[PDB]
Structures are given as structure tokens and as C-alpha cells.
Amino acid sequence: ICTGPNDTSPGSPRHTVPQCCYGFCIDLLIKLARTMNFTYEVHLVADGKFGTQERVNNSNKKEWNGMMGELLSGQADMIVAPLTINNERAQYIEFSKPFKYQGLTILVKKEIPRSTLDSFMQPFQSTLWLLVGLSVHVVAVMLYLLDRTLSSAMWFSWGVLLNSGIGEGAPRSFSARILGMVWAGFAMIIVASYTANLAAFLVLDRPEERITGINDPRLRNPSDKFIYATVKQSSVDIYFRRQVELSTMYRHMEKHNYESAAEAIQAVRDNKLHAFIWDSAVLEFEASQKCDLVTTGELFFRSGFGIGMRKDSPWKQNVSLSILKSHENGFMEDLDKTWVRYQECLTFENMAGVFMLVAGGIVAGIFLIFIEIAYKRHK
């Protein structure tokens, strides 16, 4: 029975309505409580933040906030939650041996469509098809003019260029035969060029490359086209601010930092964002369940989670020993299998896109045949 608030939106009438909480970390807490013979009164945090420190209003004296502040200001006694180990924190809070191993990682929406398969000869040029048809008609006309059966020869040439093999062409001069052989070679070359263009487009599948980690200059250099930020209050900001090599990214992300993971994920859903740096486990799970996004990129700043408590507390060595013992004898692996990692997730468009067009012929030729029926009657 958690005892957190429901006024996360500012200005709401906070009332501390009791709620429910049944996570994996809760299972670890239950095991720890059972082993050590104590009792617990778990309650959520007031504001909601991983405890990134800041300065008070117009006073140069540092003070904490969020979970770390609540623990340090004699309010709570244990901070059992994801509390990734850092250096600024560990100066005065005695952490424990880690119960997980995770590092920061990017998150970006995956491009669902990669091909259409219904495209005509547009990628090279439609005007190329127009001029090729014009040249074919011109060479056919010249071939029939130099014969001194134009319709039969035209049908035969159309069949040859479309590989129909009608065989109704009867050239009268050897010059026409040589011209037809040259035109067949040209058509073969054109087919080879078209297949080469098709292969060039196919091998270029997924032109949108994947950003890898933070070393990639295409992400280090900021731009107004790309927008990303992690959260306005967490250990990622502490990690970034501490080391000074990419302060430009620091300002860029500070201008657009978010408040919680759920809001950032929802913003990514409607493409309000384009990238997300966060802990490996959370993003891996989010990709595992709703596999619409991806978990590309490498991982950096490897530091596991832990259970925090004040410098002088009589539970320290025992808690560390119990965590290590469970980790070694394999109780943690069962929890990992149960909770975090449990789920897993040419076409007809290449045919139908022309098949209906074929139906159009069935709706066009027959009437023309009736016109042909008139053509015999007219003559």
C-alpha cells in the first residue's frame, strides 16, 4: 500500500490518497524485509526527481531535492528505488553493492516503412520513359518508311521490346534487319541500365543511418532540426554538467529538458522529440513491449543502481551481504526473468498496384473491340 500523491500537475489539491505499487523493486524489498526481520511503511516521493542537487533562491548555499533531499532531511530512512550510483551523491550517502548493471543509451523512433514496391519508372525519370517511347516510335516509323505490313511490324516490334515474342515481323531488306538487331541491342542495354538502377536503389536500403552513441559528430554539433533532452532533474544532468567537453549540447538540452520518463516517451510517440538518452533497462523494456521504437547506439557511463542510506546506519554491511548472497545464488536472475525481460513481438503492393491497372485494360479493350466491330462495318 503506497501512500503517494496524485497532484503531479502543479496547483492540484494534494491529498496523499493511498495507492498501489507492485514492481520488481518491491519484490526485492519484500525479500530483504523477510530476511532481516523488520517492517516497512513505503510511501512515494512528494515532487518526483532523482535528486539532482541545485542552489536555493538567490543564496550561494547548495541544497538537495527529491528522493536524496527527502532521505537527507531526516524524513525517510531507506531509498529503495532506481538510484544510479554517482560521485556527487556518494560523497555523503552510503550506497550499497549494485543490484543491476546499466548504462546510458539513446532512444529513437524506428522508421516503419522502407519500400513501396508499386513505383513505376519514376525513380530514374518519367521523362526518360517518355523519350524512350518516342525514340522507339521514331525508329519504328523510319524502319517502315525505308521498306519501300506497317501494323504487323509495329506489333512485332512492341512484342520484342516487351519480350512477348509475337514473331509477326517480316523485314524486306537486310538493312531493316540490321537496324532491328541494333535496336534489340539498345533495348537490352536499356533493360540492363534499368536493372542497374533498381539494384542501386535496393542496395541503398535504409538510407537513414543510425546515430551511434555520443562520439558521432552529426549529433555533437547541434542544429535546429534535431531536438533531444533527457529530464530536467536526474543523474544524467549531473553526469553532463560535471565534465566539460560539449557544453553546447548542455545548453541545447537545458532549453528543452523534460520532467518524467512517461511524458518524454509520449512526446516521442507523436514525434515531438527525435532522440532520448536514458537508462538502459527502462529503454530496453520499453522497446521490448511496444516495439515501435528502437534501442540503437552504444552505451556509456556504466554504473549500476543501488540502495542508499545515511552514513551511520546499523543496516549497511548486512544489506550489502544479503544483496551479494542473493545475486550469487541466483534469486535475482529469477526476478529478472519474471519482471523486466518477459515479452517479445516484396508484398502484394507490387502486384495489386498493377493488377487493378490490368483490370482497367479489361474495361478499355472490349469497347475498342466494338469500335473494331464498327471498323469492319465502316470499310
Binding site: 526518360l128 520484342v160 538493312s175 533495348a187 537490352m188 541500365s193 542497374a196
Partner: protein, 276 residues
């Protein structure tokens, strides 16, 4: 380049050389052998059949007929299939490859020596009171006097004007221009000379006339260069965003012109045959 530049290289194919004559005479010999075997009017039909088999099997000819004729037809078809597969693979490999050529690749070019009587007048991008402009003035005066017309305020404004198309050419320091091109927006701008420099002289730390620091500073700088710190420093501070990372209608113009020439030759041959 104003826009994407690609060279179809229609005439760069290995044909139109001794290889084309070699395959032509080989095909002629094969046709003669086919005619002789079939004979053991049909010559032209067999030639058309082989030309189609090389190009496309949609040309029906009944000149050859026999078991050995069938064997040689199968061999010819297999050879043609292998040849066309190899040609398609080679064309795909060429399409994977790229052929980009330089624009001018020279400061003392014909264009930038007397551009008045050559096309619309070009542009000499620079800024006065510098070190490159002084060299341009000192070497040859006419180019400098023409360059006095086109002059921006700094560098970023000049690059913006170049991207907008206001000006044509830019001349300035090599290192700054290289840095700007390496980290440009979209990698749409690249220097005319691919790693080309004209008046190579390094930078410097101007001491005073006779200061008692020159020996120590020179020794320390040489030690820094030798020990390798300069490599890491240059990688950190001077590296481009992309830089190192790197049936067309126009492509068919040359082949269509060749087809037109062959058409004219065929018409001339037909006229000559009709005359006789």
C-alpha cells in the same frame, strides 16, 4: 557544385576499342561456322538469330536446324547469358562507384586571369586588410583590381551569400576554409581543389624583435609536435562533421546520338542498295 553532380560516363565503357572488334570478329566467325554446319539466304537469318541471342531471344529465325546446331545454339546462349550477367554486375559496381571531377583546380586559371571576356563575369571572394588579398595584389594587379568590386565584411556573411548564390567564388585562408567546409550545414559546400593549396606558409606566434623567449618557445613547440599531443589536439578541435565520411534521361543522350548515327548509316546503306 550548385546541385548534385554525377557523371553517367556513357562513353567510358570498355567498348569501342580492340575488345569490341575482338567480339565482333568472334561473332562473325561463329556465324560462319554456324552457316557451314547448317549447310552440311540462311546466312542473313542466322546472323539475325545470333544478334538476337546476344540482345534478346524475341527474334525468330529458322536458318539453323540440327543436333550440332542445337548444341552450338545452347553454347551461344550460355555465353550470351554469362556476358549479360557480367555486364549487369559491372554496371552495378560502377553505379556503386562515383566519379567527381574538379571545377577549376588552379588559381591562375583562364577564368581567374581575364574573366571580362569569358561568360558573365565571375567573382573573387575575399576581404581587404588581410594577408591573402595582399598577396593577390602583389602577384598580379588586374585580378586584384577586379576583385575590388566583390568584397564582403567577414567570412560567415560571405558563406551565407555563397549559399544563397549571390556570389560565385571565394578565396581566403586554407585552414579556416577547410574547417568551414568540414562542418558545413548538410555538407553542400566543398572547395574546388581537393586538398589543393597555392602559397603554403604556416601560422606563427609573433614574438618581439629580439625577445629572450624565441629559443625556448621554438624548442617547446617542436617538442610538442614531436611527442604527438598536436595530433590529439587537432582531432579534438579541428575535425569536420562529415568531411571524410562520404535510366537517367541525361545518361541516354550519348547512346541516343549513337543510335541516330547508326540510323543515318542504315538509311545511306538502304539508299545505296536501292541504287544498285
Amino acid at each position: 557544385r550548385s546541385n548534385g553532380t554525377v557523371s553517367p560516363s556513357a562513353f567510358l565503357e570498355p567498348f569501342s576499342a580492340s575488345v569490341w572488334v575482338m567480339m565482333f570478329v568472334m561473332l562473325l566467325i561463329v556465324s560462319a561456322i554456324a552457316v557451314f554446319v547448317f549447310e552440311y539466304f540462311t546466312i542473313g537469318k542466322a546472323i539475325w538469330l545470333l544478334w538476337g541471342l546476344v540482345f534478346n531471344n524475341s527474334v525468330p529465325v529458322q536458318n539453323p536446324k540440327g543436333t550440332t546446331s542445337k548444341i552450338m545454339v545452347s553454347v551461344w546462349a550460355f555465353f550470351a547469358v554469362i556476358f549479360l550477367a557480367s555486364y549487369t554486375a559491372n554496371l552495378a559496381a560502377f553505379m556503386i562507384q562515383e566519379e567527381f571531377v574538379d571545377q577549376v583546380t588552379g588559381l591562375s586559371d583562364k577564368k581567374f586571369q581575364r574573366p571580362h571576356d569569358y561568360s558573365p563575369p565571375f567573382r573573387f571572394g575575399t576581404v581587404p586588410n588581410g594577408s591573402t588579398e595582399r598577396n593577390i595584389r602583389n602577384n598580379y594587379p588586374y585580378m586584384h583590381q577586379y576583385m575590388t568590386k566583390f568584397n564582403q565584411k567577414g567570412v560567415e556573411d560571405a558563406l551565407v551569400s555563397l549559399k544563397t548564390g549571390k556570389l560565385d567564388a571565394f578565396i581566403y585562408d586554407a585552414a579556416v576554409l577547410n574547417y568551414k567546409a568540414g562542418r558545413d550545414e548538410g555538407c553542400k559546400l566543398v572547395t574546388i581543389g581537393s586538398g589543393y593549396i597555392f602559397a603554403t606558409t604556416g601560422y606563427g606566434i609573433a614574438l618581439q624583435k629580439g625577445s629572450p623567449w624565441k629559443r625556448q618557445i621554438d624548442l617547446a613547440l617542436l617538442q610538442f609536435v614531436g611527442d604527438g599531443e598536436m595530433e590529439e589536439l587537432e582531432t579534438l578541435w579541428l575535425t569536420g562533421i562529415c568531411h571524410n565520411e562520404k535510366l537517367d534521361i541525361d545518361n541516354m543522350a550519348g547512346v541516343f546520338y549513337m543510335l541516330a548515327a547508326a540510323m543515318a548509316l542504315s538509311l545511306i546503306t538502304f539508299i545505296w542498295e536501292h541504287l544498285f
